[PDB]
RNA sequence: GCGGCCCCCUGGACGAAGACUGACGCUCAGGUGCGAAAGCGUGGGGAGCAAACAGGAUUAGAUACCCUGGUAGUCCACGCCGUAAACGAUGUCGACUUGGAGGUUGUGCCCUUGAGGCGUGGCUUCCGGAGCUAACGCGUUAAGUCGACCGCCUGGGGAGUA
RNA sequence: AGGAGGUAAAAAUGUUCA
C-alpha cells in the first residue's frame, strides 16, 4: 500500500504547469522555480497519498462502488485499462453533467442501453434496414463512449477518483453537493479545496497516471478481499 | 560654469576667412576664463535642403565651458552678423572629445577589410 | 515617394506611397477638426485591439476545429 | 531530504526519449518532464514514403515550429542541383550578413554589398527578394550564398 | 534650488557639526534663504502659478516649524526671529 | 524586435549621422518603435536628435525642396 | 496616521482570519500586549511572541478548531473618535456573554465576566464575538 | 491642463548608501489662492477655421442638416468672470489582506560569460480570487476589512427657481 | 498574420379608456 518517492520521482510527478497558470490555493504545495515552472514537494504528497490510500482501503472494504474519471486523451485509456483491472466503474471520455445530481434521469438512457445491448446480441438489427440499423448501431456507440462503463452501477457510487481538478470541475462540484467523498489529483493550477483529499502531483505524465491508477488498483483490489 | 557646444554654419564666401574669425570668438572666451575644447571644422559639405538659396555650407563646432554671461553676449555676435547662418547651442552633461571626423571611419574600415582577408586565411589553415 | 527604377521596369512598381502614408494622413486630416474625438478613437483604437489580442489568447477550445 | 534527490537530479544532467505509444499520425515519446512529447510522423518518414521506427526505440528529438530542425535533412536532394529558395536579411555585423533561409543562417560578405557608393544605398536593410544557393555546409549548420546570383537578387 | 555652495554656509552657520542638517533651526533658516531668493523670480513674471504653488508649500512648511519651535523652547524661537529676521 | 545601444550604452549624439540615418524612411519620417522595438529611453533621445539634425539641415525634412 | 493602533491590531487579526495565516505581525506596545494577554488566557489565540529590541514586533499565532477560523467577529467599539465608558451596572454581555467583551479598568485590562465579580466599571475596548 | 527645436530663471516627485532633528502629524467649517472653453473690458494682430448674417438648393414649410462666401470670436499683453458629464461620475490620509499578463522609470548582486538570470522601490493599463454589492461591476491605484476628519442627501415636479 | 482606400438625398404623424 505504498510506492517509493523514487518511482514517483522518476515518473516525473514534481513537474507542474507554467508558473503563470498556477492557482494561489496550492501555495503550500509549491517547492521552487526551475526553468520558470512550479515544482512540488513530495514531503507533502506521499504522507497524504498514504492517507489517500488509507481512506481508500476502508471504503473498498465495505464494497462501496468506485468511480474513476478522466476526459484527457493522454490519460484517457489509462483509466479504462485499470478500470477493468479493479473491476469497477469509469468515465474515460465525455463527462455528462448531472451524472450524479440528475442520476434518476440518466437511468433512462441506461435501460435504453440495455435494450440496445440485447437486440444487437440476438441481432434484431438483422431484421432492420441499413438506416434503422445504422441509426441505432451508431447510436449504440454514442452511448458506449459515455455510459459504456457505468451500466452496472445503478445508483450513487460511494467513492470518486478524479484527474486534473479544474478541467473536471463539473464532477468534483457535484460530489460536493451529494455528499459523496472525493479523492483527487490536483495540479499546480487547479483549485484543490473542492475535494476532501487531494494529491498534489502531475496529471499530464501518462506513466505517472499509470503509477497513480495502478497504485489505486493496489488498495482497491485488496479492499474487495 | 556650464559646458556648452556651439554649432554654426557660415556662408561659403567668408568661409575662407572663418578660421581667422574663429580666433576672434574664442579669444573673448579666453578672457572670460572659458576653456574651449572642440574646434572641429567639418569643412564645407552639401546641405540637406536649400537654405537661403545656396547649398553646400560650412560647419564648425566649439563645445566650450564658460560663464553664462559671455556665452550670451557672444550670442548677439551671431544674429546680427550677416555671415553666420543657423547657429545653435546645447546642454552640458560632461563635455567630451573625439567622435568628430567620420572620414577616417570609412578609410580605416577599408584597412580593416584587408586584415579581414588575413583572418580568412587564418581560418582556412590554422 | 520618389520612384524611378532606371530603365527595365515597364510598370508602376510603386507601393511606397501606401506603404508610407498616401491617404492614411490625407484622408485623415482631409477635414474634421476633431481635437476631442482623436482621444476617443485613440483609446478605442487599441481598446478593441487588446480584445483581438485577449480573446485570441483564450479562444482555443473545440468548435470541432 | 527531498531536496537532496532533486539536488542529485540536476547533477544527472536536445532530448533523448523512448517511443511507447504509436497511434497513426501521432507518435508518443517519453522524456521525463511533466508531460510526454508528441512527434508527428513527418520527422520519422523516409524518402520512400514509410516509417523507420518502432515501440522500444531510443530516438532523438529537439524541440510545428521545431520539427524543422530535423526536417532540413529532406532539402539535401534539392541543394545538390542548385535549388532556388526564398529568404530575408535580418542580421548584420562587420561585412557579414545573416539571412534566414528556411531557418538557416546564411553568409553574405560585403564584397559587392558595399563598394563605391554612387547614391543612397539603403535598399539593403528591409529587402525581401529571392536568392540562389550553389554550395551547402552541413558541418557548420550553415548555407553560404553564392556571388554571381547578384544578377537575380538585385534586379530580378 | 539653492546650490550646495550656499547651503554649506548656512548649515555651517546654524549647525553643531558639518553633518548636522536636520536641526529645527537649519530647516527654518534654510527655507527663509530660499524664499527671498525666489523674490526676483516673482518680482517679474508672476504668471508662473505652478511655481507659486510650490512656493506656498514651503512657506506654510516654514510656519509649522516655527509654530512648533515656539511651543517647544521660547528662548531660541525669540532668538531665531530676532536674528533670522522674519515675522513682522 | 532587436534591441539598441542598450548593451552599447551611450548618450545619443546627433552629430554622427552614420548610424542615425537608419532610423528614418525616404521621406525622412522617423520610424516608430513598434518596428525597431527600441526601449523608450533611447527612443526619445533618438527622436530629439533627429529633430535637432533636421534643424542643422543634415537630414532633409522630406525629398521635395 | 494610524489614529487608533488598537483597532489596527484587531483589524490585522480579522483580516488574518480571512487569509488563514498562521502568524500575524504588528508594532508592539504595552496596551497592545494586554489585549493579547487576555486573548491567550481565553483561548482565542495560540500563544504569541515578542521579537526585537527598539521596535518590538508584536506577533500572534491564530487558532483553528475546524476548517474555519475560530474568531467569529471582533468589533472595535470605543474608538478614539467617540469614546465609550460604562458604569459597572451596564457592563454589556455580547452574544449572551458567550462572546467576550474586552474591557479596560483601574485593576487592569480584563474580561467583563471577571469585572462583574471584581465589582467595578470601566472603559469597554472591543467586543470579541 | 500641458506636446517642433533652443536659451535663461524656477517647482515638484523618485531612487541609493549614510547622517540629523525628534511626533514638528492627519483632516479641516469660515477665509485665501489656483481653476478648460465660452463670454466681457483696453490696446494690438487677424491667415485658416468660423457663431450671427446673406445667397443657392433641400423641403409640405427649413429662419436646419448640405454648398459658396462671410463679422465677432479663436492668437498675444494686462485684467474680469469662477462655471462644465471640471468624470477612473468613486473626498483627503494611514495600516492590513491570495496572483497573472504588460508598460514606464531607477537600483543591487551574479559569469558582460550573448538580444541575459535572480531580488528590491515609485507610478500605471487590462483580466480576475476571497469578500463585497440591488445588479452591473470594483477587485492591493478597492465599492474588500477598519480607523481619523470634512462636505453632502432625505419622493418627483415646483427648482437648483423667487 | 499585419494596416490603408471605396460604400446609405428625402420618407412627418397616429384621439380617450380597457
> Are residues G32 and G46 both part of a single domain?
yes
> Are residues G56 and G77 both part of a single domain?
no
Instruction: Give me B115's grid cell.
Output: 586584415
> Are residues G25 and G53 both part of a single domain?
yes
Report CB contact under 8 Å: C20, F63: no
How many domains does chain G fold into?
Answer: 2
Residues of D annotated in the binding site for RNA, as ranges? Answer: 116, 119
Query: Closest Cα to residue F13, out of B11, B44, B61?
Result: B61
Query: Closest Cα to residue D84, out of D129, D136, D133?
Result: D133
Distances (CA, A) of D85 to D75, D106, D132: 11, 12, 6
C37 CA → H159 C1’, Å? 35
- Any residues with CB less than 8 A from the CB of C55 and at least 6 apart, and which? none
CB contact at 8 A, G97 and G59: no
| Alpha carbon of B48: minimum distance to chain F alpha carbons (Å) | 5
Report the nucleotide nearest the CA of residue G78, measured to C1'.
H147
DSSP D73: G
- C10 CB-side CA count, 13 A: 2
DSSP A122: I
Domain ranges of chain E: 1-88
> Are residues G77 and G95 both part of a single domain?
yes
CB contact at 8 A, A49 and A177: no
- In this structure, what are the phi and psi dihedrals at residue G61, rounded to the nearest 5 degrees? -135, 110
End-to-end CA distance of chain B: give it in Å, rounded.
57
- Considering only CB atoms, A15 lies closest to which of D2, D28, D33, namely D33
- Any residues with CB less than 8 A from the CB of A45 and at least 6 apart, and which? A8, A13, A199, A200, A201
Chains that touch E (3 or more CB pairs under 8 A): none
CB-strand contact C20/I, under 7 Å: no
> Are residues G67 and G85 both part of a single domain?
no
> Are residues G4 and G63 both part of a single domain?
yes
> Are residues G20 and G48 both part of a single domain?
yes
Give the angle subtended at the CA of B27 by the CAs of B24 and B31, to the nearest 5°: 145
Report CB contact under 8 Å: F21, D122: yes
Radius of gyration of chain A (CA): 19
> Are residues G53 and G78 both part of a single domain?
no
Distance separating alpha carbons of residues G88 and G102, to the nearest angstrom: 14
- Domain span at G26: 1-71
- Any residues with CB less than 8 A from the CB of D137 and at least 6 apart, and which? D143, D144
Distances (CA, A) of D116 to A133, D85, D121: 83, 29, 10
> Are residues G37 and G84 both part of a single domain?
no
Distance separating alpha carbons of residues A216 and A92, to the nearest angstrom: 16
Distance separating alpha carbons of residues F34 and F1, to the nearest angstrom: 8
Q: Which method resolved this structure?
A: cryo-EM
> Are residues G65 and G85 both part of a single domain?
no
> Are residues G4 and G65 both part of a single domain?
yes
Distance separating alpha carbons of residues A95 and A69, to the nearest angstrom: 8
CB contact at 8 A, A195 and A182: yes
Would strands D104-109 and D143-144 be described as parallel, antiparallel, or unpaired? parallel
Specify the DSSP element, H or E, that contains A210.
helix A206-224
3-state secondary structure of A4: coil
- F27 CB-side CA count, 13 A: 11
Q: E1-88 has which CATH code?
A: 1.10.287.10
Report the nucleotide nearest the CA of residue A18, measured to C1'.
H100
Q: What is the DSSP string of chain B?
A: -EE---EEEE-HHHHTTHHHHHHHHHHHHHHTT-EE------EEE--SS-TTS---EEEEE--EEE-HHHHHHHHHHHHH-SSEEEEE----SS--------HHHHHHHHHHHHHHHHHHHHHS--
Distance separating alpha carbons of residues F7 and F21, to the nearest angstrom: 20
CB contact at 8 A, A30 and A42: no
Give the angle subtended at the CA of A39 by the CAs of A36 and A45, to the nearest 5°: 170
CB contact at 8 A, A7 and A211: yes
Q: Where are the beta strands (DSSP E) in chain E?
A: none
Instruction: Give me B65's grid cell.
Output: 565651458
In this structure, is the dihedral angle defined by the CA atoms of residues B52, B54, B59 and B62, taken in order, positive or negative? negative
Give the angle subtended at the CA of C22 by the CAs of C17 and C24, to the nearest 5°: 125
CB contact at 8 A, D102 and D88: no
| Alpha carbon of F5: minimum distance to chain C alpha carbons (Å) | 26
Residue with cell 438489427: A125
Query: Closest Cα to residue D149, out of D132, D130, D127, D128?
Result: D132
Is residue A12 classed exposed, middle or buried when 0-12, 13-18 and 19+ CB atoms within 10 A define those classes?
buried
Residues of D annotated in the binding site, as ranges? Answer: 116, 119
Residue with cell 519620417: F29
Q: What is the DSSP string of D22-65?
A: EETTEEEEE-SSSS-EEE-TTTTB-TTSSB---TT-EEEE----
Amino acid at each position: 500500500a505504498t510506492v517509493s518517492m523514487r518511482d514517483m520521482l522518476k515518473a516525473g510527478v514534481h513537474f507542474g504547469h507554467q508558473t503563470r497558470y498556477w492557482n494561489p490555493k496550492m501555495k503550500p504545495f509549491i517547492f521552487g522555480a526551475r526553468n520558470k515552472v512550479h515544482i512540488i514537494n513530495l514531503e507533502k504528497t506521499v504522507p497524504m497519498f498514504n492517507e489517500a490510500l488509507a481512506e481508500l482501503n476502508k471504503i473498498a472494504s465495505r464494497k462501496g462502488k468506485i468511480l474513476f474519471v478522466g476526459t484527457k486523451r493522454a490519460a484517457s485509456e489509462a483509466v479504462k485499462d485499470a478500470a477493468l483491472s479493479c473491476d469497477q466503474f469509469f468515465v474515460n471520455h465525455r463527462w455528462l453533467g448531472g451524472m450524479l445530481t440528475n442520476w434518476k434521469t440518466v437511468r433512462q438512457s441506461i435501460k435504453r442501453l440495455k435494450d440496445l445491448e440485447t437486440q444487437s446480441q440476438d441481432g434484431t438489427f438483422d431484421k432492420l434496414t441499413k438506416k434503422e440499423a445504422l441509426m441505432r448501431t451508431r447510436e449504440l456507440e454514442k452511448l458506449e463512449n459515455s455510459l459504456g462503463g457505468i451500466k452496472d452501477m445503478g445508483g450513487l457510487p460511494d467513492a470518486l477518483f478524479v484527474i486534473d481538478a479544474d478541467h473536471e470541475h463539473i464532477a468534483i462540484k457535484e460530489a460536493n453537493n451529494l455528499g459523496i467523498p472525493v479523492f483527487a489529483i490536483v495540479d499546480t493550477n487547479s483549485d484543490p479545496d473542492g475535494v476532501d483529499f487531494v494529491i498534489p502531483g502531475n496529471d499530464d505524465a501518462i506513466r505517472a497516471v499509470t503509477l497513480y491508477l495502478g497504485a489505486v488498483a493496489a488498495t482497491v483490489r485488496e479492499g474487495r478481499s | 560654469m556650464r559646458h556648452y557646444e556651439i554649432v554654426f554654419m557660415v556662408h561659403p564666401d567668408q568661409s575662407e576667412q572663418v578660421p581667422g574669425m574663429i580666433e576672434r570668438y574664442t579669444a573673448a572666451i579666453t578672457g572670460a576664463e572659458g576653456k574651449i575644447h572642440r574646434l572641429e571644422d567639418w569643412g564645407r559639405r552639401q546641405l540637406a535642403y536649400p537654405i537661403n538659396k545656396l547649398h553646400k555650407a560650412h560647419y564648425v563646432l566649439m563645445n566650450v565651458e564658460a560663464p553664462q554671461e559671455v556665452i550670451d553676449e557672444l550670442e548677439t555676435t551671431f544674429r546680427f552678423n550677416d555671415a553666420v547662418i543657423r547657429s545653435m547651442v546645447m546642454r552640458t552633461k560632461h563635455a567630451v572629445t573625439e567622435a568628430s571626423p567620420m572620414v577616417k571611419a570609412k578609410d580605416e574600415r577599408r584597412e580593416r577589410r584587408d586584415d579581414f582577408a588575413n583572418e580568412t586565411a587564418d581560418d582556412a589553415e590554422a | 515617394i520618389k520612384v524611378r527604377e532606371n530603365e527595365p521596369f515597364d510598370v508602376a512598381l510603386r507601393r511606397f506611397k501606401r506603404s508610407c502614408e498616401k491617404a492614411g494622413v490625407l484622408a485623415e486630416v482631409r477635414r474634421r477638426e476633431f481635437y476631442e474625438k482623436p482621444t476617443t478613437e485613440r483609446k478605442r483604437a487599441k481598446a478593441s485591439a487588446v480584445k483581438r489580442h485577449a480573446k485570441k489568447l483564450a479562444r482555443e477550445n473545440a468548435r470541432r476545429t | 531530504s527531498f531536496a537532496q534527490l532533486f539536488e542529485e537530479s540536476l547533477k544527472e544532467i536536445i532530448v533523448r526519449g523512448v517511443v511507447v505509444a504509436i497511434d497513426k499520425d501521432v507518435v508518443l515519446v517519453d522524456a521525463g518532464l511533466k508531460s510526454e512529447s508528441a512527434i508527428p510522423a513527418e520527422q520519422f518518414k523516409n524518402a520512400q514514403g514509410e516509417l523507420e521506427i518502432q515501440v522500444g526505440d531510443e530516438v532523438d528529438v529537439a524541440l510545428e515550429k521545431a520539427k524543422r530542425h530535423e526536417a532540413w535533412i529532406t532539402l539535401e536532394k534539392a541543394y545538390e542541383d542548385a535549388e532556388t529558395v526564398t529568404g530575408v536579411i535580418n542580421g548584420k555585423v562587420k561585412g557579414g550578413f545573416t539571412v534566414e533561409l528556411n531557418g538557416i543562417r546564411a553568409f553574405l560578405p560585403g564584397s559587392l554589398v558595399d563598394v563605391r557608393p554612387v547614391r543612397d544605398t539603403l535598399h539593403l536593410e528591409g529587402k525581401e527578394l529571392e536568392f540562389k544557393v550553389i554550395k551547402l555546409d552541413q558541418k557548420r549548420n550553415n548555407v553560404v550564398v553564392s556571388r554571381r546570383a547578384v544578377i537575380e537578387s538585385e534586379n530580378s | 534650488s539653492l546650490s550646495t555652495e550656499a547651503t554649506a554656509k548656512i548649515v555651517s552657520e546654524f549647525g553643531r557639526d558639518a553633518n548636522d542638517t536636520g536641526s529645527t533651526e537649519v530647516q527654518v533658516a534654510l527655507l527663509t534663504a530660499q524664499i527671498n531668493h525666489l523674490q526676483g523670480h516673482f518680482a517679474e513674471h508672476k504668471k508662473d502659478h505652478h511655481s507659486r504653488r510650490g512656493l506656498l508649500r514651503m512657506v506654510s512648511q516654514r510656519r509649522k516649524l516655527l509654530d512648533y519651535l515656539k511651543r517647544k523652547d521660547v528662548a531660541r524661537y525669540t532668538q531665531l526671529i530676532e536674528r533670522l529676521g522674519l515675522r513682522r | 524586435f532587436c534591441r539598441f545601444t542598450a548593451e552599447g550604452v551611450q548618450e545619443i549624439d546627433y552629430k554622427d549621422i552614420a548610424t542615425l540615418k537608419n532610423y528614418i524612411t525616404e521621406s525622412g519620417k522617423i520610424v516608430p518603435s513598434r518596428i525597431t522595438g527600441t526601449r523608450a529611453k533611447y527612443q526619445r533621445q533618438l527622436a530629439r536628435a533627429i529633430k535637432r539634425a533636421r534643424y542643422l539641415s543634415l537630414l532633409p525634412y522630406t525629398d521635395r525642396h | 496616521s494610524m489614529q487608533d493602533p488598537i483597532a489596527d491590531m484587531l483589524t490585522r487579526i480579522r483580516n488574518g482570519q480571512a487569509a488563514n495565516k498562521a502568524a500575524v505581525t504588528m508594532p508592539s506596545s504595552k496596551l497592545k500586549v494586554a489585549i493579547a494577554n487576555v486573548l491567550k488566557e481565553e483561548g482565542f489565540i495560540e500563544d504569541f511572541k515578542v521579537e526585537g529590541d527598539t521596535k518590538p514586533e508584536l506577533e500572534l499565532t491564530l487558532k483553528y478548531f475546524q476548517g474555519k477560523a475560530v474568531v467569529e467577529s471582533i468589533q472595535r467599539v470605543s474608538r478614539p473618535g467617540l469614546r465609550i465608558y460604562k458604569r459597572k451596572d451596564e457592563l454589556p454581555k455580547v452574544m449572551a456573554g458567550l462572546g467576550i467583551a474586552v474591557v479596560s479598568t483601574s485593576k487592569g485590562v480584563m474580561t467583563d465576566r471577571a469585572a462583574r465579580q471584581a465589582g467595578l466599571g470601566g472603559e469597554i475596548i472591543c467586543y470579541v464575538a
